RNA sequence: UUUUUUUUUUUUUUUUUUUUUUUUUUUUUUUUUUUUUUUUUUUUUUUUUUUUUUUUUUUUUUUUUUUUUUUUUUUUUUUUUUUUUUU
């Protein structure tokens, strides 16, 4: 079966490669700058636009009389990117909206209302968005809405995303979107600045039902399991401030607790363009579906082989304020972060793989990856991962459990007088668990968050990887080479 | 001490809590501003005083206790009339 997964994968891929094609075509954009990372970029922001049912509701519902609000519902904009003499700047490419229907509906179907076909690829390129922009701004203009602090912002991978995505992107979003999310939704009910609903998830659970549901389903799909798994079982239970001081306190307990949540790799489809020119130029053997992974080693082999030859804008301008900047291999750091996620992983892990010194916000600089005045073009530095690693989704060992199988009450065929190991406080736990205890959960949970805290901050000793866990070369997906990343001081 | 059935799968993967590989919604806004903790642009109360005084630290104009002595002595420093040790 994974084989023909990544078949069906490569099928998709070439699907939105036919389409970024199609799109690059027409907007006008030249053959050289159809490579362009911003570029990309401009083309899934055009698709998203396009595709916001919500906002084109809203839309509907303020468009008026205006015959220049008429016009351009059906003019479509793109600001892309094109060069000339090794400069490059910005156009506006105009194309109707039915012209993207058009390509839309001949590469994906004509039933682009198969919601699941379109906003699934459109839900990963839109995390994309958010991972950028994420790495990038810190949401601020966002949070100003969404009313939380730099740490909930840490863990609010995927938090800079339309709604409608949030539903799509269950897995791998990080623990504080769910949770700003239903926080907001408490807001919500006071502000009225929103309308509730009711969903279904074929594959997964036919049953039928709310935000509340799904964002307590969502969160139940991440929480550690035992204490934080059994606050999500009686959060229907607790009252609006429990359920906000619980958010909470889940929340800090999640920047040190690591259960369940789920990496992703998105390179841009300039990148898989890239891919495919790459291919061609290699004359027959650098094979999509042998890529053709959300997960596993082809995600390194992919960006690396963009590593040889990509292209992108350099202004000489900057994300930045002060005198001090740095160099075009910061935007390679931002596009990796963006392109696997690492906004919370260990720059030194991430140093080792890019086999290159790793940095902190005081030092990241880099470009607004939006079309510009004037500015030059630049290509990829080689093989930038000159180290790979094996990808993962939850803590080493999580806490520490009970005796698997052993110590339980002992059973006795043979007529012996006997001691025993005497363990019928645990059973009877065991018993409370299963009988679905109520009484004392708050607190009690709270209690457990803070022991097991304590505990952690004792397991920390061994706490680190999958046990295989090394920095391997690119000549050695092979695992053959085990090194750690720093001793320290 | 006793007596029969048969339509969800096999000739491998670690020290391990849950479907590990699969399947759809939509009425609070976008095509810029810094090295930054909170709505940065908006919306109502009322019983201790007025139409002057200096270069200035506190109520500047107000409100109660009682067991060691009286109806004299000099130009003046301390109990001026009193109370136990011995190689």
């Known amino acids: 079966?994974?084989?023909?997964?990544?078949?069906?994968?490569?099928?998709?891929?070439?699907?939105?490669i036919q389409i970024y094609e199609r799109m690059c075509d027409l907007f006008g954009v030249s053959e050289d700058d159809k490579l362009i990372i911003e570029n990309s970029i401009s083309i899934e922001r055009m698709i998203r636009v396009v595709t916001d049912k919500k906002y084109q509701d809203?839309?509907?519902?303020?468009?008026?009389?205006?015959?220049?609000?008429?016009?351009?519902?059906?003019?479509?904009?793109?600001?892309?990117?094109?060069?000339?003499?090794?400069?490059?700047?910005?156009?506006?490419?105009?194309?109707?909206?039915?012209?993207?229907?058009?390509?839309?509906?001949?590469?994906?179907?004509?039933?682009?209302?198969?919601?699941?076909?379109?906003?699934?690829?459109?839900?990963?390129?839109a995390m994309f968005k958010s991972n950028l922009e994420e790495v990038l701004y810190q949401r601020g203009k966002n949070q100003l809405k969404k009313r939380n602090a730099a740490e909930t912002f840490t863990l609010s991978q995927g938090a800079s995303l339309e709604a409608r995505f949030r539903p799509i992107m269950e897995k791998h979003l990080g623990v504080?979107?769910?949770?700003?999310?239903?926080?907001?939704?408490?807001?919500?009910?006071?502000?009225?600045?929103?309308?509730?609903?009711?969903?279904?998830?074929?594959?997964?659970?036919?049953e039928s039902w709310s935000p509340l549901e799904?964002?307590?389903?969502?969160?139940?799909?991440?929480?550690?399991?035992?204490?934080?798994?059994?606050?999500?079982?009686k959060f229907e239970y607790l009252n609006e401030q429990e359920k906000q001081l619980a958010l909470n306190l889940?929340?800090?307990?999640?920047?040190?607790?690591?259960?369940?949540?789920?990496?992703?790799?998105?390179?841009?489809?300039?990148?898989?363009?890239?891919?495919k020119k790459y291919a061609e130029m290699n004359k027959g053997s650098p094979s999509l579906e042998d890529l053709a992974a959300y997960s596993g080693v082809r995600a390194?082999?992919?960006?690396?082989?963009?590593?040889?030859?990509?292209?992108?804008?350099?202004?000489?301008?900057?994300?930045?304020?002060?005198?001090?900047?740095?160099?075009?291999?910061?935007?390679?750091?931002?596009?990796?972060?963006?392109?696997?996620?690492?906004?919370?992983?260990?720059?030194?892990?991430?140093?080792?793989?890019?086999?290159?010194?790793?940095?902190?916000?005081?030092q990241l600089?880099?470009?607004?990856?939006?079309?510009?005045?004037?500015?030059?073009?630049?290509?990829?530095?080689?093989?930038?991962?000159?180290?790979?690693?094996?990808?993962?989704?939850?803590?080493?060992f999580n806490s520490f459990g009970t005796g698997?199988?052993?110590?339980?009450?002992?059973?006795?065929?043979?007529?012996?007088?006997?001691?025993?190991?005497?363990?019928?406080?645990?059973?009877?736990?065991?018993?409370?668990?299963?009988t679905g205890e109520t009484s004392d959960n708050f607190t009690q949970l709270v209690q457990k968050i803070r022991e097991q805290v304590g505990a952690f901050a004792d397991q920390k000793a061994n706490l680190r990887e999958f046990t295989g866990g090394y920095i391997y070369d690119i000549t050695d997906v092979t695992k053959s080479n085990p090194k750690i990343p720093q001793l320290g001081g």
């Open 214 to 233: 799904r964002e307590i389903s969502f969160l139940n799909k991440k929480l550690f399991p035992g204490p934080m798994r059994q606050l999500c079982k």
């Open 300 to 362: 390194f082999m992919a960006f690396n082989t963009a590593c040889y030859m990509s292209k992108f804008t350099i202004g000489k301008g900057i994300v930045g304020d002060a005198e001090i900047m740095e160099n075009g291999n910061d935007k390679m750091q931002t596009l990796a972060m963006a392109c696997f996620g690492l906004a919370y992983e260990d720059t030194g892990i991430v140093a080792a793989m890019i086999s290159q010194p790793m940095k902190k916000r005081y």
């Open 176 to 206: 504080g979107t769910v949770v700003a999310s239903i926080k907001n939704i408490l807001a919500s009910k006071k502000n009225g600045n929103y309308r509730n609903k009711m969903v279904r998830k074929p594959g997964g659970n036919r």
């Open 404 to 434: 698997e199988s052993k110590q339980i009450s002992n059973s006795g065929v043979f007529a012996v007088q006997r001691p025993s190991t005497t363990n019928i406080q645990r059973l009877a736990e065991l018993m409370a668990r299963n």
């Open 1 to 16: 079966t994974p084989e023909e997964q990544r078949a069906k994968n490569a099928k998709t891929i070439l699907e939105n």
């Open 250 to 275: 889940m929340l800090d307990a999640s920047l040190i607790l690591k259960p369940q949540v789920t990496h992703k790799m998105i390179m841009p489809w300039s990148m898989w363009l890239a891919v």
């Open 58 to 125: 809203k839309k509907l519902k303020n468009a008026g009389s205006d015959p220049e609000k008429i016009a351009n519902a059906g003019k479509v904009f793109c600001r892309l990117v094109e060069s000339t003499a090794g400069k490059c700047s910005a156009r506006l490419g105009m194309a109707l909206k039915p012209n993207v229907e058009a390509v839309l509906t001949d590469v994906l179907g004509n039933e682009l209302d198969r919601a699941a076909v379109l906003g699934k690829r459109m839900g990963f390129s």
């Open 365 to 396: 600089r880099v470009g607004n990856f939006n079309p510009p005045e004037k500015g030059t073009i630049k290509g990829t530095s080689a093989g930038y991962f000159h180290k790979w690693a094996e990808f993962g989704n939850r803590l080493p």
